[PDB]
Amino acid sequence: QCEVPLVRTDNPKSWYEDVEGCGIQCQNPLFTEAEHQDMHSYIAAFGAVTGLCTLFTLATFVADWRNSNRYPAVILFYVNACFFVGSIGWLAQFMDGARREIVCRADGTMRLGEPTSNETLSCVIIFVIVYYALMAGVVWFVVLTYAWHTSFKGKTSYFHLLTWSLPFVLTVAILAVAQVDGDSVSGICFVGYKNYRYRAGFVLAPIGLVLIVGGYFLIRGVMTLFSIKSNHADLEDNWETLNDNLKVIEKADNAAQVKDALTKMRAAALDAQKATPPKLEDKSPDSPEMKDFRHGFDILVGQIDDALKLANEGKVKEAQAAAEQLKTTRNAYIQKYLAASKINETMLRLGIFGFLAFGFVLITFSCHFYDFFNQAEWERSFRDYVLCQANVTIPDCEIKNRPSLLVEKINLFAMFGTGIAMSTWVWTKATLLIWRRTWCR
Ligand SMILES: CC1=C2C[C@H]3[C@@H](CC=C4C[C@@H](O)CC[C@@]43C)[C@@H]2CC[C@]12O[C@@H]1C[C@H](C)CN[C@H]1[C@H]2C
Structure with a gap:
């Protein structure tokens, strides 16, 4: 059948x-x-x-x-x-x-x-x-x-x-x-x-x-690793360019380079402020620690703008002097959060x-x-x-x-x-x- x-x-x-x-x-x-x-x-x-x-x-x-x-x-x-x-x-x-x-x-x-x-x-x-x-x-x-x-x-x-x-x-x-x-x-x-x-x-x-x-x-x-990873890089990048321009202000022999360097520094100072450090990845954007971070730069840029206020007028002997005082400001509000990530x-x-x-x-x-x-x-x-x-x-x-x-x-x-x-x-x-x-x- x-x-x-x-x-x-x-x-x-x-x-x-x-x-x-x-x-x-x-x-x-x-x-x-x-x-x-x-x-x-x-x-x-x-x-x-x-x-x-x-x-x-x-x-x-x-x-x-x-x-x-x-x-x-x-x-x-x-x-x-x-x-x-x-x-x-x-x-x-x-x-x-x-x-x-x-x-x-x-x-x-x-x-x-x-x-x-x-x-x-x-x-x-x-x-x-x-x-x-x-x-x-x-x-x-x-x-x-x-x-x-x-x-x-x-x-x-x-x-x-x-x-x-x-x-x-x-x-x-x-x-x-x-x-x-x-x-x-x-x-x-x-x-x-x-x-x-x-x-x-x-x-x-x-x-x-x-x-x-x-x-x-x-x-x-990966976004948590991408944040931690990129943030340290963003801070490291600026800190280094910042220390380069710092080295340019001193070696400079005119008010043109000092102003340019101070701006390159401020341009990096701010772009570094817009980043959550790897040490504060777990904290809130409105947390206390995150507050001291961003506030630390409000003083920093203030120091830069003080130097700029002397570079433009032509006070190079006095503008370069402020750049020295930026070393201590740097070491205070940057070196801390910078680095440190494993x-x-x-x-x-x-x-x-x-x-x-x-x-x-x-x-x-x-x-x-x-x-x-x-x-x-x-x-x-x-x-x-x-x-x-x-x-x-x-x-x-x-x-x-x-x-x-x-x-x-x-x-x-x-x-x-x-x-x-x-x-x-x-x-x-x-x-x-x-x-x-x-x-x-
Ligand atoms: C034979 C048969 C099939 C063999 C197919 C299966 C779909 C996926 C796979 C996986 C692939 O790796 C190998 C081939 C295999 C096993 C498919 C299901 C439908 C059917 O089973 C029904 C039983 C029903 C009584 C009558 N009509 C029959 C058929 C339409």
């Missing part, structure tokens, strides 16, 4: 749409066996590489767990933790005969509407292991960005309830609606393949959520890893968008192809459009590429000693 891609099944539960005794075949009808075994080889690579890289970092973080549980470094361990769990699920398919066990029902049809009766949970198990790891990962990614964010403006750890609960609820949720569909080319079960509304609601949207949140802490994070490489690399993680997560969001965007067509060209290839009666039947294997190879590059990058948090020149030190056993 049946005909490719429809396969014979006595099971009423597996019948396709309203066709008698015909369910949809397990192996994805939208891809050739060549595309399967190529895509499997892909995952086998990145799946295995990341799985090892992460476990190396897990195994290292526990080799100094005493001095590797303190924030913010402990985050990268839980970020790595989730990744190692995720890698497991993907690598599960390559076990001989598992890829068919995860995706196919009893009657040789691709798993759908899982969890279902009389069908082993080997599908929903894989879906849980992955979906939980994925979500627990990005939630811990928010923790990572938030920790880096506030390090300038902390032992408190009430994230655990949040990082472990939110993925759990989301997991139980998809199970409740029973929308764990299966796929052969990837070798994993996941939410809403047949019904992609669940995929958008449970994957695209939560990832889109952590993106805008995780970003805000990275955006408002960030530590601990936060530098967290910024690197904070941003590097953000990027590859944004890619994952992009993939699951397109996959969600064009699927409505992949349904049309399928339902038509089913009715076509069944109409064979005795080239014409050919699938119009399908999921781009490129988009997946891109996703699985970034999805794993993150875990590979997150694993290099412990690739510093200080970690080898940790392993040599514990090596004594």
Whole structure:
């Protein structure tokens, strides 16, 4: 009765749409066996590489767990933790005969509407292991960005309830609606393949959520470093040009250079006043300390304007004399706030890893968008192809459009590429000693 891609099944539960005794075949009808075994080889690579890289970092973080549980470094361990769990699920398919066990029902049809009766949970198990790891990962990614964010403006750890609960609820949720569909080319079960509304609601949207949140802490994070960094530079720049012109006023032999220098000094004196020093980054624009800063220049420029009041009249012997008195004013209201700023490489690399993680997560969001965007067509060209290839009666039947294997190879590059990058948090020149030190056993 049946005909490719429809396969014979006595099971009423597996019948396709309203066709008698015909369910949809397990192996994805939208891809050739060549595309399967190529895509499997892909995952086998990145799946295995990341799985090892992460476990190396897990195994290292526990080799100094005493001095590797303190924030913010402990985050990268839980970020790595989730990744190692995720890698497991993907690598599960390559076990001989598992890829068919995860995706196919009893009657040789691709798993759908899982969890279902009389069908082993080997599908929903894989879906849980992955979906939980994925979500627990990005939630811990928010923790990572938030920790880096506030390090300038902390032992408190009430994230655990949040990082472990939110993925759990989301997991139980998809199970409740029973929308764990299966796929052969990837070798994993996941939410809403047949019904992609669940995929958008449970994957695209939560990832889109952590993106805008995780970003805000990275955006408002670098702006805190951009402020501190640029402000010291702005103060340093002026202080130096100020001390140059100071050296020009003395060496000068006319009232023209002294006036010009005094103006170059005043032009820098003011531009330096319009900046929050790195020592007062945490204070308010209307705070007391910030007040003494800006007021310190109101006196300074006053001293300059006094000198200018002598340079213009032509009192060079007396204008240069005021420039000497500017040394003490300088040392008072400038040398104090100037300089003094250290960030530590601990936060530098967290910024690197904070941003590097953000990027590859944004890619994952992009993939699951397109996959969600064009699927409505992949349904049309399928339902038509089913009715076509069944109409064979005795080239014409050919699938119009399908999921781009490129988009997946891109996703699985970034999805794993993150875990590979997150694993290099412990690739510093200080970690080898940790392993040599514990090596004594
Ligand atoms: C087969 C199939 C699909 C294979 C597609 C999936 C969207 C995303 C990916 C990810 C990508 O890496 C590989 C390909 C994969 C798994 C798509 C969902 C719709 C459909 O499932 C329906 C079941 C239903 C019974 C009938 N109609 C069926 C088909 C329209």
